[PDB]
Symmetry: D2
Subunit: 153 residues, 4 copies
């Protein structure tokens, strides 16, 4: 059959630091839900352990959180519209530089930041007219690094 | 400190350009793969979509966004590390898509599943490595597929 | 001031595995491509290597690391933006490699150059975009090739 | 043998987004790197562009597309397998870019070359591998850098 070259989306990032495992999630349908899991409490200090990305039913993935630290606080984000940017803070946690906070911005609403808004700032932006259709990164016990896939609207 | 994070090497993709690019590289091993078809096992099976998953949770389905009703499904319980995939590419309703697929682990072979006809593809990786994810293009069907690999 | 760095979308590769992965995406436009072959134009041409270059200095050569002497070269001076690449894939001395290649801009066509016979390949990008670089696999010959692209 | 082609694993990028995405992964070893600066060796050197090469043919220059006059260059003749890169990121004329860089091979070290200040970066690869190419973002300066690596 004709070998019609298949395409791979452009990427922005990753930011943060190297983690034991590389991960990627780029669903065919829009990303519509994000669940961030923390240890600690919102009245004290939040420690981001894992992130869960989902697209409609069935499509879902959880990165970070393979360690023993119990989860004690979850934040559910229901995305309305197209994500165009994500930002947050990077800092050391129990020995590793990881994503400590995170904020999702769509062309309609703003969600976050969530977590410990302290440390080194990061900002994943894409050219005007594009949208984020996925995420990839490095992770282990925690979320070491994050990057995004993007394509024209 | 900005300590460069890594991205696994890739093999492929093979097949044809499709409407959407897709990627699924879970942090835990792949353990289950569900293939959905139209047609029938007694005659000819038409591969429509593929579902990849890793326990617990972690799942994705590619292809199958169209109106064609599904009529059959085959669940592959992955035993071991996937070291290669192969199959056939043939035309279907106007497009060239993945028509058959076989998963090979050091422990056993699964497939080929689907329709054994068309152009053969073969995704092999260097010895000592294992496939830890898949990526590709898809729309109504599975247009293209490729794999992520790393040291075992 | 401190945003994450970007990587261009990719289309491909087409062809088959080769010993070395190669990549060339210069900061300035691809304006000269030199194709090196064995054999002769009055007979059949065997593509051995390809040289990509961007104005002075920026240059790379893939394939052709074998001992087979080159007896024919085709120089292509690209006028505008390359939006498509096509050609043929076929066996050469026990290897499936790029045998033929044609470059297409918005107003001109260059080639095909080489041996027009085998399995056809085509690298197309979404309208409004342009090819800004290439990647693939190579060794003695040119095993596979893919393109980097971005908006005009 | 019709096997899918492979793409080397990646580490990075580090630094900040830049106008152009760039990539250079030659088939043969990288045996020479030239760093071009403005300023002076006695005071502060400002990294403006980096030139990578393998043999007198494969060469690429990233950064330096601006009118800023160069005033110093440093040539690094790599002896062994480059297994690590490091340096500093800092502001220069309103841009966060690579200001310092150091190359480490399986034999010796080269650098740090450039200005001391800013955020450190480190591109390290798993044991047993080596850097076979580099990619990143650039404009008037070198905005971001990453490495392609494979088993040595
Ligand atoms: C506790 O160590 C584990 O978790 C951290 C954090 O996510 C990873 O960086 C590391 O590679 C993994 O082995
Ligand atoms: C029927 O057309 C749809 O499905 C095919 C196949 O999977 C895709 O290639 C195409 O882009 C999409 O629009
Ligand atoms: C002759 O063998 C060499 O050249 C061929 C073709 O380029 C490559 O596929 C192969 O890996 C390399 O070792
Ligand atoms: C002067 O501006 C130019 O050079 C800087 C630094 O290289 C790039 O970041 C920017 O995108 C490009 O347009």
């Amino acid at each position: 059959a004709l070998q019609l070259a298949a395409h791979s989306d452009a990427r922005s990032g990753p930011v943060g630091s190297n983690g034991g495992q590389f991960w990627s999630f780029r669903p065919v349908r829009p990303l519509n839900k994000i669940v961030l899991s923390f240890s600690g409490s919102p009245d004290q200090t939040l420690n981001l352990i894992s992130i869960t990305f989902s697209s409609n039913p069935t499509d879902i993935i959880t990165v970070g959180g393979v360690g023993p630290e119990p989860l004690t606080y979850t934040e559910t984000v229901n995305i309305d519209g197209d994500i165009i940017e994500i930002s947050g803070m990077i800092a050391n946690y129990k020995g590793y530089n990881v994503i400590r906070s995170i904020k999702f911005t769509t062309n309609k609403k703003e969600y976050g930041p969530y977590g410990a808004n302290a440390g080194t700032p990061f900002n994943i932006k894409i050219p005007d007219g594009n949208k984020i259709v996925g995420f990839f990164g490095n992770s282990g016990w925690y979320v070491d690094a994050i990057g995004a896939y993007y394509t024209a609207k």
